[PDB]
Each structure stands twice: as structure tokens, then as C-alpha cells.
Design a protein around this nucleic acid. Structure first.
Ligand SMILES: [Mg+2]
Ligand SMILES: [Mg+2]
Ligand SMILES: [Mg+2]
Ligand SMILES: [Mg+2]
Ligand SMILES: [Mg+2]
Ligand SMILES: [Mg+2]
Ligand SMILES: [Mg+2]
Ligand SMILES: [Mg+2]
Ligand SMILES: [Mg+2]
Ligand SMILES: [Mg+2]
Ligand SMILES: [Mg+2]
Ligand SMILES: [Zn+2]
Lengths: 151, 211, 224, 127, 114, 99, 82, 100
RNA sequence: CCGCACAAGCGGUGGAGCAUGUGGUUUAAUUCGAUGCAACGCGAAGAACCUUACCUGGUCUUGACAUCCACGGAAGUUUUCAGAGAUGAGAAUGUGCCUUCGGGAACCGUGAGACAGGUGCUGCAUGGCUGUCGUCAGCUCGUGUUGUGAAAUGUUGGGUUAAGUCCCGCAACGAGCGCAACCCUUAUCCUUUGUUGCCAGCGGUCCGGCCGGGAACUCAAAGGAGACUGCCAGUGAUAAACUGGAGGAAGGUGGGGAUGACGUCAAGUCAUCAUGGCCCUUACGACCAGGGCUACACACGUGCUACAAUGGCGCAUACAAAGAGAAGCGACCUCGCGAGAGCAAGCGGACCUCAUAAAGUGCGUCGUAGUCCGGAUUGGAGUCUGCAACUCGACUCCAUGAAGUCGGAAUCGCUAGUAAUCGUGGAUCAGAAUGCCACGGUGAAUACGUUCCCGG
């Protein structure tokens, strides 16, 4: 973008609910460009969400995200020729994106003998404001504050 | 960096081929190999004639070839005796009844072969390459060639190093497929060394395609 | 033109007393409100004697180049040239318009070739975008040499508005010996004008007066 | 009246035909669900008809050939939209805002020399 | 549930616990299971001893794991004793099927040596 | 009973001319044509190293496109088949005749 | 390794030399250039030299060696480490 | 390259031709099963005798113009260099650069 | 100022095993070159023999190949012994055609030497071709002006573009090499033509596009039309230019190629070819068998398969494009577990074949483990190609079941149908694909910005 920022491909919504955050979300969980393998695992989570954690999974969909959607961010930059780890805000879209990465990663670190089960759990886990995605929101919300020497 | 071949690129756009005959995978390889051989024999016979072009189209049974040269009377000889025996040698070396036609070019300077080879020769006359090529470009401009470009490379005047050089006259555009550009290379084997020569002649852009 | 005819148009008007050129002292009536006032007593006879020379030149088949690059007065000077079948420069002056006659002739030929080609055809053979681009190039050549496409050779006389603004033209003319007829405001240097008219060069009314009188006398010189 | 349609996407092509009546889908003589083992694809063909909500008004005899399941469906949807514009004669504006008449081009890039993929670059080892 | 070679390797699907024995591989094991008529996925544990008896038979019919290793050892033994090309290589502990020794021969070559 | 004829060439202009001349001559002989049907032309791609010196990057791609036309006359007579034999075509074109 | 429709490839002239040896009883190891020909039952308990490419090496055949190529026994390279 | 090599190739070719028949029928006998296994045995043994150069395997594609062992184009039997050249001139009927 | 240069992102390398090149090493030979970019799965689009130049040995000396003039024999065909074959040694058959009868043609062989030959050295003698900076935006000239003049101006400045793109300013104006465009392809539509291609309508049909027929639509392939910030609104020096919207199939050079301005780097190539000169010439020339180009204490580069539940396994089950092909593909049917084999039609290919695409989808399975993961390696047993497969081919079946549990330092690649994945074909080829060249399936994420890394 040294000339002009090139926009990331603009996405379209899941049909199962007409929503898109799913769409962007599944696009995250997707591995080796296989859409069919990915969407299966979200329904193996959101469906089991609407029951394990209570109805309205699509609202549980984000109660975790809410628990994870970051606010403070650290774009370390050598403004003076020396790298400064300055805490900074990010527009809404990113923190959503970031969070989405922040959870899917946690669905790859739990074992449980299945990937579908891991996504279901971590979602609810962070849906109760407890776990890792929220944690990796905590720590970033911790080291961002810890380094505030200069703007 | 390395330039592309102006003739090749403009093939099927403004440059018709040199051999038209249809062929199939089984006979294509033999047909080109025989075509290469007659051309090789003919060019040597036409070295005296100073041939500019040699086209070869094979009809389904017969083979026909046309020659473009600055010396029609030399190719005619007397009652076509020379070219007659030539038709013979070619018909046989190609194992096909042969028909030989001549279409002499009326503008020898406006053909890159004739000019290039004249240059090669004059160099073998050890004339001053510089004035040689310069006289040639002036003659082409006098004939009205929209533009001319020439290049002599290697051992200019038996130089113990290769002082490769080029000269450009008028306008000779490249990268524009609309432009009609005759091109040709040639060589001259001086006792000191082998010297290559390239020639471009732009005669104006064509409109409406190969027609 | 009579002194009364000029004065109503405002020919006596000039630039500020802050901005004047030294050689213009003889032609300056005085100052009012820190404004230079031009003397019509000199202006009228010099303009008449210049009109005599212009009539003479046009009556020996002279080619006349009206020169002015003011954005306000460009169309006035162009129409002035058209009213007497002459040649003009109404857009920014280009150096070597006179001394470099050969390059201008090649540009004139390119303008003529493009207009002839469009009438002849082959625009359809070109892509529609390319044909439009060729029309734009023809328009650009017209905006550059609309006045001098038919001049044929170097002109026989020059009429210049605001000689200081067009100083390159007068330098060229003097280098060629082509006579210069110019409306010279107080801020201009009058050395380059062989028949000098000291007068306002901005005001549309006085400029149109100059042009109309010159063109009437040029048509008169042509008529014989 | 049978309504002809021609929708093309990726490497699939699709002839489409609409008949007013009870809503039904018959593609390559298959039944949609029976055609696609994926739901998204059934939803994609239904989406243009669903947006106008005229599903019960037109039945569908359609044919698709070439490409893969996603291209098949895309081309089918495209053909559907063209047939809908033809039948209503006022749907062109609705489809244009919707985004279903885009076509989208996007043919796969041809592999290029010296490149393991049409754009992938063979590893260049600096060190 | 004893069978040729190892006894009761693991409680896994018959074909699995079967292939577990050296000299018994996916195909020999599945063919033996088909010959026995015992089910493919039934666990070796909890399988009828009478069925296990049919297995000891159908397997001892093959060269048993202990016997197999002896015989291949003797094969390679001769192969070397003849000092034959592959005989030599075997003695040299190097690839004996034209695999390049120039690079990537570690499988038989073993740990890197300066 | 038919007379089908396949024409192959490297330039469409020649093949088009050949077909045009063969349908029109059929009209002169009162032969009923099936029309100059176009057919998938065959593209042959060749990749070739362009440098004698050792490199992999230097490469070039050429193509041979074989234009292909088909015609056929439902009811031939001496006047139709003999006219095709009488007709003389250019070299670059290919004539295949079947009944 | 080899198609068993026609059987193991052996050289004719090697058959000649070997059978002549045989009928003539033991002879000093005849020499051979065909590393390829397959050992046979008639060639048992006899020696033969075989060009390792720079020189023919003497190998004394035995029952088991039958059914293999003569060349396998001859080494075409040397090696002694680093 | 070496005219020696070119002539070697010409010879290999011309020679290996005539025995095509013999070579062929020989394999036939050999390949052909249901034989007594001696008729073949000697038959294959007989085939062995023929000039080793008889096998088409002995032959080697070689650019006709330059006798070059690598870079052979079955469609032309020429070197990648020489075919490029002949193309650039336009000899190869219809051949043009491919862009897509 | 700009560029996957950086940054934000995915997927990697660097670990493992193996394929693959290179150096080192060894060899008799392991033939020759390439050596940062711009060598190192490079030449080589394919070393068993051949290939082939390297080694070993066998051999020939006007010769393997060419012209020369003699002498003789038709040309040939078949056939035997020795040899490893080179080759000798024979031994038979034929001993032909034109001729104006002389001979000639035709070849074959022996002699004469003139001569042949070189993959011998010299890319620092060169031509030719190619790599690079770099498709980088630059490089210049005519005229003019000024300078007595070496010169400068133009190309400078400011907006502003992908661009020395364009405009306004500007003693500069024009132009060229260029850029752009013209080319091919793809994205929409229209005309013409309708078989081997299609079936909308129908009549029939065994219900198969299959057949009456249809010529609609798909496709097919020749022609065409369409994208121009055209248009509108809003900025901007009112100019250029930008932005958004509408229309539109596509929007701002619509996507992709080809095209490399000078010029640079004694770049690379004298083993494509050509060639200056030097050296061998009973041999650095020529033929033949075997070995060698595949060696392994080793080191680097490139690539492939993995480490496993988005997985594996089994069962059923689905959507392609582009091509190749008559010493060919090789249908069908029979045999075999397969490798294949037999049989054998059709196809020179919109007709036949290769060939029934995988990922997917549906069902059971396994339940985290060195596992039902991965697959190396090895034994055994065969198949095929090629006289011939041991060194040293490919593939099948049985068994073995490594290492490896996502790989430091460091590092590399990509901004959309992209990367990633999964299949497909082709070249080279008797046979010998992880290598190359193409075709499709599914198909991401991020790019705040330019401080910086490099590059220009
Ligand atoms: Mg070979
Ligand atoms: Mg060398
Ligand atoms: Mg070198
Ligand atoms: Mg050098
Ligand atoms: Mg050897
Ligand atoms: Mg090697
Ligand atoms: Mg690698
Ligand atoms: Mg598995
Ligand atoms: Mg694990
Ligand atoms: Mg590759
Ligand atoms: Mg693909
Ligand atoms: Zn003034």
C-alpha cells in the first residue's frame, strides 16, 4: 500500500443464518481452502452452544467475543529509530478479527480427541469470561499497559 | 537486454510466412527438413543473383517456389537454362515435380537481405564499414524508407577488440505490431574475424490486418 | 481614432506610479491617485502613423500577426484577426514561434494531416478510444496553432498587445527584422517597438478599440 | 411460458428454464438436494428466488455442465437471475442492487514459467 | 487368547490385534479372519476361545513370527556368505537396492559422523 | 450417398476462402450444402529453452492453431463430385473427401 | 526382476565355452566380458574370469550361485573410507 | 556434433531397419506363449546374435541439422535452438508465438 | 518516490526420512562446463547398452564421415567358422538397368596421396543466442534561444500518473528511442453457420440424445458491438489530475500475457551452430566389449511424505477442464490379487482410446497412540519394457513398520480466484517423473502506514 491501501476481499454472509461474522469467522477456522470441512465445525459448536450454555448461541457467538474483543493494542514501532512498544487502539473490525483468531487458536490446543468438541468448549469457556481467548485479551490488556514509557 | 525478433513477432499480423504448405505430424518434420535443404542449395545458386527472399509452398502433389531478387535477367539467363536446371535439381532433391517462379524486387535498397549482404560484401572488400553503412541508409531514405537502422558487431576493421557499434536513421519503431518492419541479419567472414550485421527498415504502419 | 474616441474608452489609463519603466517618461502626461496617466497627444498621432504603415503592408499583400496572450483578451484578438483575414497568436506565446519557423511548419503539417486523415477515414480502423485520442490530439494542435496554420511563411507585420508581457515575441521579431506594432503601457520597455503605441493594454474596451481600428484600416488597405 | 436462461461462472455453464406453477427444482434431471451433498450450494441457487420471494410462482427445469460444485451453483444462480429479469421485466433494478447479475469473471490464472504456480514464486535462497 | 508369536498383543479389532504379530500384516490377517469366518471388528479380548483355537491353527499354518525371523536371517546370511554385491553391501551396512549413497542415505547409514 | 469434405488450414482467412469457394461452386453445380460448419481448431503448444548457455529461466512458448472447417452435400451428381476434382485450392489448405 | 516367460538370459557363446569346458572337463577359468549372463546348473563347481571393466576377475561358481547374474559377484568399484 | 557421431547414427538407423522383420518375428516366437520352450529358447538365443545395433533402443534421436543428442523435437527432429531460429524466420508454416 | 522492500497476514524453509543438484571425498574413470543476484531438480524436454566426451582392454591408419583420380567387381540376396565384438575367415545365390556398344548409370571394394577429423585451447580473438539490473523510466537528438565559445535550455519548477503519464508555469518548440496503444486470451452481447456438437418444443421411443425431428438454447468459430473517470456530482490552479455515484457484464490503463530505452556486468555459452588464430594429426582422428557418468567419512541448495482426528481406514457416492495419439491409443470380452496377460474391434480422433478426476459427499470405523499415523528401509515372490534390467529400470503382491510427536539460529514465498490445497494431461521418452510445462476442482487471511530492511 506504499501507494494506496488495497482492501481485503469483501466477504458475503453465511446462508444458514444470513449472518457474516460467521462467514468471516469460518474463513478463519478454514484450513487448506476447504469450506465444507470448516462450516461443519462451527455448527458442531454453535449448535452445542445453544444447549450446553443456554439458548441463543448466536448471542453466545459473541458473549465470548465480547469477552475477547480486544480494546488496547500494541503496534510496536521504531518512530525514533528505536522500537517503541506503544499501546494503541484498533478500529472495531480488527478486534473482532483479532478475537476470532484469538479463539480458533484455543480450539487447536485442547485435544479432547476431536476438533469439533474443542471449538464448542472454548467458545462457552470464554462465553463465561474465562479461559484463553479472553486471557490473550487479558495479557495484551496487561503488557499494553505495562509498557507506557512514551507516546 | 536481449531484443526479440521483429520478423517472428509480426508473423501472422503484418509478416506472412516463408512456407505455406499444409502438413500433418507424420510428414511435417520431413517437409521442413527438405524445405531447409532446397533453400540452402538455392541460396548458394542465388548468391550470384543476390536473392532477397525464397518462398516455398508445396501443393498436395507438386512443390512450387518463388524467388525475389535484384537480378531477374541473371536468373533468366538465356531462355531460363540456369533456372531450368535449377528447377530440375530442386524437383529431384525434394522428390516432387517442381514449379519455379521469379518475382524480382523493384526496390533493392528497400529489402534488408540485399542491403545486408551488400554490406557484408563491401566489408569483405575491406572498405570503410562506416561510410559503407552510411551510404546505404542515405540510399534507403532516397528510396523513401520511412526509417532505417543498421548495426555492425565484432572486430570492426580487424580491431584486436570487438568495437560493436550501431547507426539509426529516421524513425524505426519496435513494440508496435502495427508497424511494417523488414529485418534481416547477415555475416561477413573477414580474415581477422567474423562480423555480424543487423538491418531494420520501417516502411510505415499497416492498417486492417495482414491484408 | 480621435483623442475623444480614445478618452471615452479610457486609453489614457495606466499602471501604478509604483510600477513604471524609465524610457516611458516622454509619453506620460502625469500622475493622478498614484496612477500613471498616458498622454493622448502623443498616442493619437503615433497610432495614426502606425495605421499608415499597417495599411501599406496590407496593401502590398502583407501577412499580419496579431499577438496577445491575455486570458481576457484572447478571443478579442482572435476575432480581430479573423475580421481581416490574417493570422494570430491568442494563447501562451511559445519561444521560437518565428526564429524556429521549421518546427512550427512540421507542427502545422501534423495539424493538417490529422484533420485530413479524419475526413479521409481509417478512424474506424483505429480503436474507438484511439480515434477519440487522435481527435483530442487534433484539438490540442488546433488550440496551439489555430491562428497560424495558414500563415504559410514568416509574417510581414506584428501587432502586439502589452509588449512587456510578450517580450519574447518582440525579441524574436527584432532578431528577424520583422516590424513590431505594439500597445505599450507605462510599465513596458519601448525599445523593441518600431512603431510604438503607448496605451492601456488590459482594459477590454481600449483593446477592442485598437483591434477594431487596426482591422478596419487593414481591410481598407486590402481593398485598394 | 418456458423462460430460457444462460448463467456462467468459473468453468461451469448452465441453461435455465422457468415455468409458472408449484415451485420445484430439476437440474440435470436430478433433484437439488439429491444433486448437492452440500447445503450452501442448495441455498446459493435458492438465494436469488428467495430475495424476490417468488419461489412458489416459478418451477425450474435447468441444466449445468463443466466446472465444479461451486462454479455449477454460481452459474446456475446467474442464469436464474437473467430468467427472473426476463419474466418480470422490472427485476433488473432489484438484481443490480442485490449483486446477483455481477457474473464476477475471475477465471483461474494460467501457470507461468519459472513459477511453481501462476503466481507462486520458487523459493529463492538469499543465504 | 494365544496366537503365533505374541499372546494377547492388545484388546483391539481382530484384524488389528492380528496384524500386531510379526509376519502377519493387514492382508494376511484379514484373509485369516475371513478364513476363520470370525467378524472383522470383534475384539480379540472376549472372543470365544474356540474361535481363538481356529486361529492358532490358521496361523501356525503360516511361517510363525519366530520361525519367519530365523529364515529371513538365513536368507540374508547366505546373501552375505556368497560375498555377492548385495551380500557385500549388507555387510557394509549401506543401501542394497541402488539408493544413492551420495546424500540422504541416513535410514540405514545412522547418525552423522564428521 | 453423401459427400462430406473436411478442410484444415493454419490461417482462418484461407480456410474461410476455401469453404466459401466450395459452397458457392456447389451452388453453381446445383449441389445442396450442409454449410461451412466451424469445428474446434487444434492448438499445439511448445515450450522451448531459448539459451544455449545453462539457465532454466530463459524459455519461449509457440503455438500451432489448426483451423478446421467441415462441409457436406446431401445429393451429389457427376456435376458435383467432378467439380470438386476440377477445383484447384491453395497449398496451405487441406482437402479430405468422403462419400 | 526378469520376465519368466522366456527364462534367465544367458549368452550363447558363453554356453559354447562352458559346455566345451564341461565335455572337456575342468579347464583354467575361461575369460568373459558378459557380466550379465545368468548362472546355470551346468556351470557348477567351475571358475571363470569376468571383466570388472578394467580387468577380468576369477570367481569360482557354486550350486546356490545358480539363478543369479555372473556380474553381481564382480565389484566394479573400490572403496576404503575417508 | 562430431560428423563421426552423425554417421554412426545414420549407420545404426539404416542397419537396424532391415532386420525389422527378423527382429519382429523373433520376438513373436519368443513372446508368443504356448511354445515348446525350446523353439523359443534357441529362437531368443538366435536373436541375441544379430548386430547389437539392430535394437531400436540403440538409436538416439538427434537433431537433423546439428546432430545434437539433447533438445530433440519429435515434431521437427531439431534442436530447441534451431527450431527457434527457423521459427523466427517464418519457415514453419503458420507457427507463431503463443500468448494467452 | 516508489517495489510482498518494509509493515499486517497466511503458507513454508531451516528438524525428520527420502528425491534431487552442487562442493568435497574416492575412483581407473567417477567426462565438460554453470558458481551471489544472474550456478546449485542448471545445460540434460529424461546416463542400463546406446546414450557419451571418462576409465580398461581390443583394434584401424586417406580413414568413421567428404571430394579427388585410378584398378577392378553389378547391385545385391542368403549362409558357415573364430572372436567379446570390433572383425577377420570364409561359402553359396544373384551378378541386374541405360548405352549412340564406347562405355555410362549404379553402387561395391583395393591403391594414390591431395585430403579427411578434433566434444583439442582461446566467450578476454569473435558472430550468433541468452541471463541481469529492469518492463526499471529513463536516455537523447532537430530546431530555436542564450553563451564569442567548452556549454545550457529543453528533460527545469508546481500539481499530478503505472510511466519524462498529462497539464499549468516556464526560451523554449518539436520529435525519436521509449511509455502507452496496436497482439493473443479471458469477462457481456449480436450476426452467420449447425455435425461427430445441443435438445427448447413436440410425435415416437426399449426411455439411452436415442430417434422422428428440432436449429431453439449450450457449445462450436469466423465475423462483429461493447469501458472512454464517457456520464453525473464533488474537489483541484479555473488546467491536468483525483474521488464517489449512477448506468453498466465489466470503472477508471476491465483480468492475464508479448513485447526489455538507452546502456551495464571482458556475465554465460569456442561441448547447438558459426568462427579468428594455435595443436594433434598410425591419432587429441575412427570402431568394439566391459566398466564410468549412480561412488560415500562427508557439507550446502532445491524438492517430496510425514508427525496424525478438518485425520486414518472401509463401504457407497459425486462435479471438471486441457490435451496426446496409426512402428500409436489400444475399446469390448476372458484369465489373474495385482503388476499384467489373452482376445481383439474402433479411432489419423467434436466419432475411438488414454480415462470411471480427486479433495468432496453419505454411513460405520477407530479415540490420541509413535497409534489402524507416517511411511523409509529390508527379505520373499513376481510382472513388464528393452537382444539384454547384476552393477543400474519401472511397477505389483506378501511381510517388515524406521526416523519422525510440527522442526533453533536464521530464513523464504504470496495482496484474489492470490496463496494454500487436491486431482488432470503433455513434453523428453524402447522403458525410466517429487523435475519441468500446462488444465481444472475447492479455495483463504492481512496490507495501519512507510519509521525502518533491501532495492532501486
Ligand atoms: Mg535411448
Ligand atoms: Mg571446456
Ligand atoms: Mg564457464
Ligand atoms: Mg569474460
Ligand atoms: Mg564401456
Ligand atoms: Mg551425474
Ligand atoms: Mg531441495
Ligand atoms: Mg490410512
Ligand atoms: Mg501425535
Ligand atoms: Mg521441474
Ligand atoms: Mg488449479
Ligand atoms: Zn500593461
Amino acid at each position: 500500500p506504499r501507494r494506496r491501501v488495497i482492501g481485503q476481499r469483501k466477504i458475503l454472509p453465511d446462508p444458514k443464518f444470513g449472518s457474516e461474522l460467521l462467514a468471516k469467522f469460518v474463513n478463519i477456522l478454514m484450513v487448506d481452502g476447504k469450506k465444507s470441512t470448516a462450516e461443519s465445525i462451527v455448527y458442531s459448536a454453535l449448535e452445542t452452544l445453544a444447549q450446553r450454555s443456554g439458548k441463543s448461541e448466536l448471542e453466545a457467538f459473541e458473549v465470548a467475543l465480547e469477552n475477547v474483543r480486544p480494546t488496547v493494542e500494541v503496534k510496536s514501532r521504531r518512530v525514533g529509530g528505536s522500537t517503541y512498544q506503544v499501546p494503541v487502539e484498533v478500529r472495531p473490525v480488527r478486534r473482532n478479527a483479532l478475537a476470532m483468531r484469538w479463539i480458533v487458536e484455543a480450539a487447536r490446543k485442547r485435544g479432547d480427541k476431536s476438533m469439533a468438541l474443542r471449538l464448542a468448549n472454548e467458545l462457552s469457556d470464554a462465553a463465561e469470561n474465562k479461559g484463553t481467548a479472553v486471557k490473550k485479551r487479558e495479557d495484551v490488556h496487561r503488557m499494553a499497559e505495562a509498557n507506557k514509557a512514551f507516546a | 537486454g536481449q531484443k526479440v525478433h521483429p520478423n517472428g513477432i509480426r508473423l501472422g499480423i503484418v509478416k506472412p510466412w516463408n512456407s505455406t504448405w499444409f502438413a500433418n505430424t507424420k510428414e511435417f518434420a520431413d517437409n521442413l527438413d527438405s524445405d531447409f535443404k532446397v533453400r540452402q542449395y538455392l541460396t548458394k545458386e542465388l548468391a550470384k543473383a543476390s536473392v532477397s527472399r525464397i518462398v516455398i509452398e508445396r501443393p498436395a502433389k507438386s512443390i512450387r517456389v518463388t524467388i525475389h531478387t535484384a537480378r531477374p535477367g541473371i536468373v533468366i539467363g538465356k531462355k531460363g537454362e540456369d533456372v531450368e536446371k535449377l528447377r530440375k535439381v530442386v524437383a529431384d532433391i525434394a522428390g516432387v515435380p517442381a514449379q519455379i517462379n521469379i518475382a524480382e524486387v523493384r526496390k533493392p535498397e528497400l529489402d534488408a537481405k540485399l542491403v545486408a549482404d551488400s554490406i557484408t560484401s563491401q566489408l569483405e572488400r575491406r572498405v570503410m564499414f562506416r561510410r559503407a553503412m552510411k551510404r546505404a541508409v542515405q540510399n534507403a531514405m532516397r528510396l523513401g524508407a520511412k526509417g532505417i537502422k543498421v548495426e555492425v558487431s565484432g572486430r570492426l576493421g580487424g580491431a584486436e577488440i570487438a568495437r560493436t557499434e550501431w547507426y539509426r536513421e529516421g524513425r524505426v519503431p519496435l513494440h508496435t505490431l502495427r508497424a511494417d518492419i523488414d529485418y534481416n541479419t547477415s555475416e561477413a567472414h573477414t580474415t581477422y574475424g567474423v562480423i555480424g550485421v543487423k538491418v531494420w527498415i520501417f516502411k510505415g504502419e499497416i492498417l486492417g490486418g495482414m491484408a | 481614432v480621435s483623442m475623444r474616441d480614445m478618452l471615452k474608452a479610457g486609453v489614457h489609463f495606466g499602471h501604478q506610479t509604483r510600477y513604471w519603466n524609465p524610457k516611458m517618461k516622454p509619453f506620460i502626461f502625469g500622475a493622478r491617485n498614484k496612477v500613471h496617466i498616458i498622454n493622448l497627444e502623443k498616442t493619437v498621432p503615433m497610432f495614426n502613423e502606425a495605421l499608415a504603415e499597417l495599411n501599406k503592408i496590407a496593401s502590398r499583400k502583407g501577412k499580419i500577426l496579431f499577438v496577445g496572450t491575455k486570458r481576457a483578451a484572447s478571443e478579442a484578438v482572435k476575432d480581430a484577426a479573423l475580421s481581416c483575414d490574417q493570422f494570430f497568436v491568442n494563447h501562451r506565446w511559445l519561444g521560437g514561434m518565428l526564429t524556429n519557423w521549421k518546427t512550427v511548419r512540421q507542427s502545422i503539417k501534423r495539424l493538417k494531416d490529422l484533420e485530413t486523415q479524419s475526413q479521409d477515414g481509417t478512424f474506424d480502423k483505429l480503436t474507438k478510444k484511439e480515434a477519440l485520442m487522435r481527435t483530442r490530439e487534433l484539438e490540442k494542435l488546433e488550440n496551439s496553432l489555430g491562428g497560424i496554420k495558414d500563415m504559410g511563411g514568416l509574417p510581414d507585420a506584428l501587432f502586439v498587445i502589452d509588449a512587456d508581457h510578450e517580450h519574447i515575441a518582440i525579441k524574436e521579431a527584432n532578431n528577424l527584422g520583422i516590424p513590431v506594432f505594439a500597445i505599450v503601457d507605462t510599465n513596458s520597455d519601448p525599445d523593441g517597438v518600431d512603431f510604438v503605441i503607448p496605451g492601456n493594454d488590459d482594459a477590454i474596451r481600449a483593446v477592442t478599440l485598437y483591434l477594431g481600428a487596426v482591422a478596419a484600416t487593414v481591410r481598407e488597405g486590402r481593398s485598394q | 411460458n418456458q423462460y430460457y436462461g444462460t448463467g456462467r461462472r468459473k468453468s461451469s455453464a448452465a441453461r435455465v428454464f422457468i415455468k409458472p406453477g408449484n415451485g420445484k427444482i430439476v437440474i440435470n434431471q436430478r433433484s437439488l438436494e439429491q444433486y448437492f451433498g452440500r447445503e450452501t450450494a442448495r441455498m446459493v441457487v435458492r438465494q436469488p428466488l428467495e430475495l424476490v420471494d417468488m419461489v412458489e410462482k416459478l418451477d425450474l427445469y435447468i441444466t449445468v455442465k463443466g466446472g465444479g460444485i461451486s462454479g455449477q451453483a454460481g452459474a446456475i444462480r446467474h442464469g436464474i437471475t437473467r430468467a427472473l429479469m426476463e419474466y418480470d421485466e422490472s427485476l433488473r433494478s432489484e438484481l443490480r442492487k442485490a449483486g446477483f447479475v455481477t457474473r464476477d469473471a475471475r477465471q483461474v490464472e494460467r501457470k507461468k514459467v519459472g513459477l511453481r504456480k501462476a503466481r507462486r514464486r520458487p523459493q529463492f535462497s538469499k543465504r | 487368547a494365544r496366537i503365533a508369536g505374541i499372546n494377547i498383543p492388545d484388546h483391539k479389532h481382530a484384524v488389528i490385534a492380528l496384524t500386531s504379530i510379526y509376519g502377519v500384516g493387514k492382508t494376511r490377517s484379514k484373509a485369516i479372519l475371513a478364513a476363520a469366518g470370525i467378524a472383522e471388528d470383534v475384539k480379540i479380548s472376549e472372543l470365544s476361545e474356540g474361535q481363538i483355537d481356529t486361529l492358532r491353527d490358521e496361523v501356525a499354518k503360516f511361517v510363525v513370527e519366530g520361525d519367519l525371523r530365523r529364515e529371513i536371517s538365513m536368507s540374508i546370511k547366505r546373501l552375505m556368505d556368497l560375498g555377492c554385491y548385495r551380500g557385500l553391501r549388507h555387510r557394509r551396512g549401506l543401501p542394497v537396492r541402488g539408493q544413492r549413497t551420495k546424500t540422504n542415505a541416513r535410514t540405514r547409514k545412522g547418525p552423522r559422523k564428521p | 450417398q453423401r459427400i462430406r469434405i473436411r478442410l484444415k488450414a493454419f490461417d482462418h482467412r484461407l480456410i474461410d476462402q476455401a469453404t466459401a469457394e466450395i459452397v458457392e461452386t456447389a451452388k453453381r453445380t446445383g449441389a445442396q450444402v450442409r454449410g461451412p460448419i466451424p469445428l474446434p481448431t487444434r492448438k499445439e503448444r511448445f515450450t522451448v529453452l531459448i539459451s544455449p548457455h545453462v539457465n532454466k529461466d530463459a524459455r519461449d512458448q509457440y503455438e500451432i492453431r489448426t483451423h478446421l472447417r467441415l462441409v457436406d452435400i446431401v445429393e451429389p451428381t457427376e456435376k458435383t463430385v467432378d467439380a470438386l476434382m476440377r477445383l484447384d485450392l491453395a497449398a496451405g489448405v487441406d482437402v479430405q473427401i468422403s462419400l | 526382476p526378469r520376465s519368466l516367460k522366456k527364462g534367465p538370459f544367458i549368452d550363447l557363446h558363453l554356453l559354447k565355452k562352458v559346455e566345451k569346458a564341461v565335455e572337456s572337463g575342468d579347464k583354467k577359468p575361461l575369460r568373459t566380458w558378459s557380466r550379465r549372463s545368468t548362472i546355470f546348473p551346468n556351470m557348477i563347481g567351475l571358475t571363470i574370469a569376468v571383466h570388472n571393466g578394467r580387468q577380468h576377475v576369477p570367481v569360482f561358481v557354486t550350486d546356490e550361485m545358480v539363478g543369479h547374474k555372473l556380474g553381481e559377484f564382480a565389484p566394479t568399484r573400490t572403496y576404503r573410507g575417508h | 556434433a562430431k560428423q563421426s557421431m552423425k554417421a554412426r547414427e545414420v549407420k545404426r538407423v539404416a542397419l537396424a531397419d532391415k532386420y525389422f522383420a527378423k527382429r519382429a518375428e523373433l520376438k513373436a516366437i519368443i513372446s508368443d506363449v504356448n511354445a515348446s520352450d525350446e523353439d523359443r529358447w534357441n529362437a531368443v538365443l538366435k536373436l541375441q546374435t544379430l548386430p547389437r545395433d539392430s535394437s531400436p533402443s540403440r538409436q538416439r534421436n538427434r537433431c537433423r541439422q546439428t546432430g545434437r543428442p539433447h533438445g530433440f523435437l519429435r515434431k521437427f527432429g531439431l534442436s530447441r535452438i534451431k527450431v527457434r531460429e527457423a521459427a523466427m524466420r517464418g519457415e514453419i508454416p503458420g507457427l507463431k508465438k503463443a500468448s494467452w
